Design an enzyme around this catalytic site. Sequence first.
Site, PDB file in Angstrom:
ATOM      1  N   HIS A  76       6.884  -3.190  -1.035  1.00  0.00           N
ATOM      2  CA  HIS A  76       5.844  -2.693  -0.101  1.00  0.00           C
ATOM      3  C   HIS A  76       4.543  -3.505  -0.232  1.00  0.00           C
ATOM      4  O   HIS A  76       3.623  -3.232   0.559  1.00  0.00           O
ATOM      5  CB  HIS A  76       5.689  -1.172  -0.179  1.00  0.00           C
TER       6      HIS A  76
ATOM      7  N   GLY B 298      -3.583   0.918  -6.131  1.00  0.00           N
ATOM      8  CA  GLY B 298      -3.640  -0.340  -6.901  1.00  0.00           C
ATOM      9  C   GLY B 298      -2.711  -0.327  -8.104  1.00  0.00           C
ATOM     10  O   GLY B 298      -2.522  -1.424  -8.668  1.00  0.00           O
TER      11      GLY B 298
ATOM     12  N   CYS C 112       0.520   0.482  -8.208  1.00  0.00           N
ATOM     13  CA  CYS C 112       1.935   0.184  -7.928  1.00  0.00           C
ATOM     14  C   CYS C 112       2.299  -1.122  -8.633  1.00  0.00           C
ATOM     15  O   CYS C 112       1.434  -2.021  -8.762  1.00  0.00           O
ATOM     16  CB  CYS C 112       2.228   0.125  -6.435  1.00  0.00           C
TER      17      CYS C 112
HETATM   18  N1  JGG Z   1       6.842   2.977  -2.038  1.00  0.00           N
HETATM   19  C1  JGG Z   1       5.946   3.365  -1.429  1.00  0.00           C
HETATM   20  C2  JGG Z   1       4.869   3.879  -0.671  1.00  0.00           C
HETATM   21  C3  JGG Z   1       5.050   5.035   0.094  1.00  0.00           C
HETATM   22  C4  JGG Z   1       3.975   5.559   0.809  1.00  0.00           C
HETATM   23  C5  JGG Z   1       2.738   4.921   0.771  1.00  0.00           C
HETATM   24  C6  JGG Z   1       1.576   5.485   1.538  1.00  0.00           C
HETATM   25  N2  JGG Z   1       0.340   5.255   0.795  1.00  0.00           N
HETATM   26  C7  JGG Z   1      -0.097   6.136  -0.196  1.00  0.00           C
HETATM   27  O1  JGG Z   1       0.538   7.162  -0.492  1.00  0.00           O
HETATM   28  N3  JGG Z   1      -1.355   5.729  -0.843  1.00  0.00           N
HETATM   29  C8  JGG Z   1      -1.712   6.560  -2.023  1.00  0.00           C
HETATM   30  C9  JGG Z   1      -2.987   6.048  -2.722  1.00  0.00           C
HETATM   31  O2  JGG Z   1      -4.048   5.999  -1.789  1.00  0.00           O
HETATM   32  C10 JGG Z   1      -3.823   5.142  -0.684  1.00  0.00           C
HETATM   33  C11 JGG Z   1      -2.531   5.537   0.067  1.00  0.00           C
HETATM   34  C12 JGG Z   1       2.571   3.754   0.014  1.00  0.00           C
HETATM   35  C13 JGG Z   1       3.636   3.232  -0.710  1.00  0.00           C
END
Ligand code: JGG
Lengths: 304, 304
Positions: free
Chosen positions: B41, B143, B145
């Site tokens: 992602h 940040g 991930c």
């Molecule tokens: N794999 C995956 C994945 C799934 C959903 C998202 C949506 N974004 C999210 O939850 N963030 C959380 C922290 O603050 C900003 C947005 C992002 C990555």
Amino acid sequence: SGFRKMAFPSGKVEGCMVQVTCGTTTLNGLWLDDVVYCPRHVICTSEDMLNPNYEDLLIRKSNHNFLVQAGNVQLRVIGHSMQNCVLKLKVDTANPKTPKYKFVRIQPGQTFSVLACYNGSPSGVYQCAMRPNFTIKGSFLNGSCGSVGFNIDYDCVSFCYMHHMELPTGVHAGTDLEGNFYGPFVDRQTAQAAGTDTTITVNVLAWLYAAVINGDRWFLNRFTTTLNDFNLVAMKYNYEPLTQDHVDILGPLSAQTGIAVLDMCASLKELLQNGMNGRTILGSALLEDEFTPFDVVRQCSGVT
Amino acid sequence: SGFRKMAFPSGKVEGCMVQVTCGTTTLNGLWLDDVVYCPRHVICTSEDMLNPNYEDLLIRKSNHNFLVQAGNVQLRVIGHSMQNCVLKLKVDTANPKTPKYKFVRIQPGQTFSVLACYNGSPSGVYQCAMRPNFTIKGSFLNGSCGSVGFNIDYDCVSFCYMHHMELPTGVHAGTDLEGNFYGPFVDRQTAQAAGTDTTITVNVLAWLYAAVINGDRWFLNRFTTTLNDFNLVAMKYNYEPLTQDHVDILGPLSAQTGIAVLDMCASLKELLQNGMNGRTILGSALLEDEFTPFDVVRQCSGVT
Ligand SMILES: N#Cc1ccc(CNC(=O)N2CCOCC2)cc1
Ligand SMILES: N#Cc1ccc(CNC(=O)N2CCOCC2)cc1
């Protein structure tokens, strides 16, 4: 989201751990620049520990009696001195992994990370607080002495603790890196009882703020209180008195959440008087006091 | 003595963390040999995340679109491929700090350390368990991930987790280092509800053994039970069923303490039915389930 008991990354401190052996006693040392710091009781037999005269025991020790091993390579000891309850072993090689560092003497209620070590080898890292009775509740087996406690500010390690002793009650006592014990404790195998292990109120409030930030809000009530009223309740429950200095320190968390410090105090008052009624806050069934206001901000803002 | 929620020393993993940027998305990568592993992602806009077609999004990406920074030095990307939910970025430089490592897919109830990172920089380390519903209860901000979970066996890091996602309930989901999610979760911003977060019974029993070893014994009772009888109570309290395999794994702790596994089960049964009555075990007011039998032995024996 989520809130964990989090230690500092331990790499900078792992690079400083060495083994110190004096006769048949092996424990851990901290190698910074060309000095190795270790508990002075490395020179004691278990027999010695009942009533040691450290200056007298040290007369019988030469540089070559202190065996210092960094990994599987021996360091050459070219000098030694006693500073309070630590020995400083001067070696002929500066530790090439020496981080930016400071020695700090922390106050009760301050938290730090411990790198538990055996034979100079890291086994684990966990988060501690200096208790109001100047003990810590650690996890230390025989061989762990000289394991250290630290905080990190970006790239500067502030060393605040070196492990020396387990009290007969299984709580822990140690020194700063100048070798001064926290609290009244001495490096001797004698009766040493800890005082009241009071709860660090400002840390509990910080953690209630962390709970609200992370969506745990059931304990927020319709009440406020005053510092004096709250403090009557704190006293009753063996909580530390809350000062205006603590209220000032909680200002950023108050601002972020829009919950006045004194309102959170009134929430804490009701939790003390009512208990949890089988509920949890941030996965705890008791009020957690080993996060400082600075810890909550750091973790909630993602400082590296 | 003392028993702490202890993470592995993080140094070996700190030396592997890098920053990966693709367009305006920055997260963490893991640099082992000449490959950087990161969540796929990284290629998504927040808009993309509602319904991403990763193969289609990846067609628009070249090696030079993946900016990989190790400290303040840029790594040259010479290839990239998608494996399940991770990207593998081939770089022209082997990480000189690569530890001995393995990729392992853990089972629910297994514990591991997380090195929480932002912009490739370590912020903290804490201990997790893979929950029976294949979530973890972490501490991850935007940040984080690509932060990883690991176990260490002497000098070999077994990587078991890479952080990808926070569920709307604030629990966490991720992959092994082959990019396969734990549990049913997908890297998409959609409705994903976790199943029952059952208690890891074998870990609770391990921790009761740790409590006895560390002098907390008030909960030991005069009763025994059978696996079938205990399991009726486990079911009622959303505990995992106890198997003979779990009893076998607890054998060393049974031997050390002289408390038969089924006697400790009967102690746990009474704690489930009676509660703690305002008492604590190893400083907890609830039954802790994020220590494995192996964790209890390791911590109680001082493995490095
Ligand atoms: N794999 C995956 C994945 C799934 C959903 C998202 C949506 N974004 C999210 O939850 N963030 C959380 C922290 O603050 C900003 C947005 C992002 C990555
Ligand atoms: N400073 C100090 C200091 C004070 C008392 C002792 C006595 N030894 C002791 O408590 N250990 C605990 C672990 O198992 C073996 C014996 C040692 C060091």
